[PDB]
Structure 1
Amino acid sequence: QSMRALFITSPGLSHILPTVPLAQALRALGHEVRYATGGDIRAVAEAGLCAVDVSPGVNYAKLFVPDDGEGFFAEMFARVSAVAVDGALRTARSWRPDLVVHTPTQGAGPLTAAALQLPCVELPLGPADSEPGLGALIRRAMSKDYERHGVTGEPTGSVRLTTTPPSVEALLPEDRRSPGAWPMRYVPYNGGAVLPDWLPPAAGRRRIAVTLGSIDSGGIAKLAPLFSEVADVDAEFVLTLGGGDLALLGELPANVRVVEWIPLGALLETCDAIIHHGGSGTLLTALAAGVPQCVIPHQDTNRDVLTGLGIGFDAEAGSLGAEQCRRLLDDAGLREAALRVRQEMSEMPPPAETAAKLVALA
Structure 2
Amino acid sequence: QSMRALFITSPGLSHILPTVPLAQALRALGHEVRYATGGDIRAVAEAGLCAVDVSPGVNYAKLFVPDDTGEGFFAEMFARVSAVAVDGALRTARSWRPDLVVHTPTQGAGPLTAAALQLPCVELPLGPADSEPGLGALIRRAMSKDYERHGVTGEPTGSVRLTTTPPSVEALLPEDRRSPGAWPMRYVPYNGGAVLPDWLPPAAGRRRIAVTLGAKLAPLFSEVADVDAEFVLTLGGGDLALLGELPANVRVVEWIPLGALLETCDAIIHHGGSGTLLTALAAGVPQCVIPHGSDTNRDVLTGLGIGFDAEAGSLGAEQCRRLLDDAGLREAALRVRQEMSEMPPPAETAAKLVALAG
Residue pair 2:239, 2:254 contacting (<8 A) in 1 also: no
Offset at 1:142? 0.5
Distance 2:192 2:349 in 1: 21
Distance 2:328 2:97 in 1: 52
Q: Does 1:349 align with 2:350?
A: no
Distance 2:135 2:24 in 1: 28
Residue pair 2:6, 2:33 contacting (<8 A) in 1 also: yes
Offset at 1:222? 6.0
Distance 2:254 2:299 in 1: 30
Partner of 1:217: none
Residue pair 1:222, 1:318 contacting (<8 A) in 2 also: no
SS across alignment from 1:281: helix
Q: Does 1:105 align with 2:106?
A: yes
Distance 1:183 1:124 in 2: 11
Gaps of 5+ in 2: none
Q: Does 294-303 or 24-33 show the bigger shift?
A: 294-303
Distance 2:129 2:343 in 1: 19
Identical amino acids, percent of aligned pairs: 100
Offset at 1:228? 1.5
Residue pair 1:225, 1:319 contacting (<8 A) in 2 also: no
* Residue-by-residue CA offset, 1:259-313 (whole Å, 9 max, x unaligned): 0100000000000000001000010000000000000001821111001000000
Residue pair 1:9, 1:103 contacting (<8 A) in 2 also: yes
Q: Does 239-248 or 15-24 show the bigger shift?
A: 239-248
Offset at 1:226? 1.9
Residue pair 1:120, 1:157 contacting (<8 A) in 2 also: yes
Distance 1:252 1:173 in 2: 42
Distance 1:197 1:36 in 2: 37
Counting matched residue pairs gives 354
Runs of 4+ in 1 over 4 A off after TM superposition: none
Offset at 1:258? 0.6
SS across alignment from 1:354: helix
Offset at 1:249? 1.9
Distance 1:250 1:96 in 2: 56
SS across alignment from 1:130: coil
Offset at 1:253? 1.1
Residue pair 1:223, 1:317 contacting (<8 A) in 2 also: no
Distance 1:320 1:72 in 2: 35
Distance 2:315 2:198 in 1: 29
Distance 2:224 2:305 in 1: 24
Offset at 1:225? 1.8
Q: Does 1:14 align with 2:4?
A: no
SS across alignment from 1:238: strand
* Residue-by-residue CA offset, 1:182-203 (whole Å, 9 max, x unaligned): 0000000010000001000000
SS across alignment from 1:100: strand
Superposed CA RMSD in Å reads 0.9
Distance 2:227 2:80 in 1: 50
Partner of 1:139: 140
* Residue-by-residue CA offset, 1:90-133 (whole Å, 9 max, x unaligned): 00000000000000000000000000000000000000110110
* Residue-by-residue CA offset, 1:221-247 (whole Å, 9 max, x unaligned): 664222112221110000001113221
Distance 1:169 1:62 in 2: 34
Offset at 1:250? 3.2
SS across alignment from 1:137: helix
Gaps of 5+ in 1: 213-220
Q: Does 86-95 or 291-300 show the bigger shift?
A: 291-300
Residue pair 1:273, 1:328 contacting (<8 A) in 2 also: yes
Distance 2:23 2:206 in 1: 37
Offset at 1:22? 0.1
* Residue-by-residue CA offset, 1:64-100 (whole Å, 9 max, x unaligned): 1013421111110000000000000000000000000
